[PDB]
Amino acid sequence: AEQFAVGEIITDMAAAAWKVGLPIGCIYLADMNSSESVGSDAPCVVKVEPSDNGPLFTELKFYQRAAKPEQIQKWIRTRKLKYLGVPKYWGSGLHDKNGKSYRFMIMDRFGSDLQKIYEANAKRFSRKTVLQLSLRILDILEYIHEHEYVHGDIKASNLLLNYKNPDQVYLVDYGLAYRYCPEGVHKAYAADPKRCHDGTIEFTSIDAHNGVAPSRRGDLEILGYCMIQWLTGHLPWEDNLKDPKYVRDSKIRYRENIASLMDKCFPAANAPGEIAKYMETVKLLDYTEKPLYENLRDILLQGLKAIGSKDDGKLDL
């Protein structure tokens, strides 16, 4: 059952009009209403799911409260950033077709995911690339955290590049996002009954493994596993992803002894100092504690100084 007629004009709740193009779950190219039909250079995309789909409703709410174009530009101005890797929300509505109710959401369009690039580069990224990606992710993380939300699923396949600027990475898929601190009140260290997702098993946090709601330390923890995966091509527990209790156990033991993790993941006890310092700092975070994001960025910056480079914004993909 196709959601839309290709070329159809759809009007959002804000009364803005859009034309629907070919697909790029159900996602299609979208642009502002025109004489001209929607093309391969479109600037936006429309996600459409049934009205009862819980994940699209969670994603829409996150975009509505933290993704407004004006809200993002004010942040980029006051924090003096070259950009922010959070997609912009352009609009949403309800659309009836063959007597079923659907929900749609217009958002920015991006380029290829980092995972396709990772695989094309023989499952490695340079130290420069990993350091530069991580500084921008920390920016994204700080932003959504200050806006009461954690992602809990950071990974290469959820990190898209600007279709026009390959040095700018955005984080997507907020369908399973979690509002950890609604109205400024942090959730207790316990299971949220509405939530049944543990994240992606190889990258997920110890809190997620323990059936505890995702928190800010969880996101920084996840980023840490990504950095190692990207630098080395492997993770110690990759061989047996099917056993969650083993994976959890390995992460608890390697959190207790980081030097062990550096020895396992990096050849000959020679490992990037910044990755060790990163994981040490994330380890010191309690469940309800606000990370010192600037301290973490400084650590990644000491790493760029060590390889003779600076944060020039170049991902050198």
Curated annotation (Swiss-Prot):
One of its GO terms (cellular component) is Cajal body. Changing residue 109 to C: In PCH1A; likely pathogenic; severely reduced kinase activity resulting in severely decreased autophosphorylation and phosphorylation of COIL, H3, H2AX, TP53, JUN and TP53BP1; reduced protein stability. ATP binds at residue 47. It catalyses: L-seryl-[protein] + ATP = O-phospho-L-seryl-[protein] + ADP + H(+); L-threonyl-[protein] + ATP = O-phospho-L-threonyl-[protein] + ADP + H(+). The keyword Transmembrane helix does not apply. Active in presence of Mn(2+), Mg(2+) and Zn(2+), but is not functional with Ca(2+) or Cu(2+). Has a higher affinity for Mn(2+) than for Mg(2+). RAN inhibits its autophosphorylation and its ability to phosphorylate histone H3. Changing residue 95 to R: In HMNR10; likely pathogenic; severely reduced kinase activity resulting in severely decreased autophosphorylation and phosphorylation of COIL, H3, H2AX, TP53, JUN and TP53BP1; does not affect protein stability. Interacts with HDAC1, KAT2B, SETDB1, KDM3A and KDM4A. Associates with the nucleosome through interactions with nucleosome DNA, histone H2A and histone H2B; the interaction with H2A and H2B is mediated by the nucleosome acidic patch, a cluster of negatively charged residues of H2A and H2B forming a cleft within the nucleosome core. It is linked to Pontocerebellar hypoplasia 1A: A form of pontocerebellar hypoplasia, a disorder characterized by structural defects of the pons and cerebellum, evident upon brain imaging. PCH1A is an autosomal recessive form characterized by an abnormally small cerebellum and brainstem, central and peripheral motor dysfunction from birth, gliosis and spinal cord anterior horn cells degeneration resembling infantile spinal muscular atrophy. Additional features include muscle hypotonia, congenital contractures and respiratory insufficiency that is evident at birth. Neuronopathy, distal hereditary motor, autosomal recessive 10: A form of distal hereditary motor neuronopathy, a heterogeneous group of neuromuscular diseases caused by selective degeneration of motor neurons in the anterior horn of the spinal cord, without sensory deficit in the posterior horn. HMNR10 is a slowly progressive form characterized by distal muscle weakness and atrophy predominantly affecting the lower limbs, and resulting in gait abnormalities. Upper limb involvement is seen in some patients. This is Serine/threonine-protein kinase VRK1. The chain holds residues 20 to 341 of 396 of the full protein.
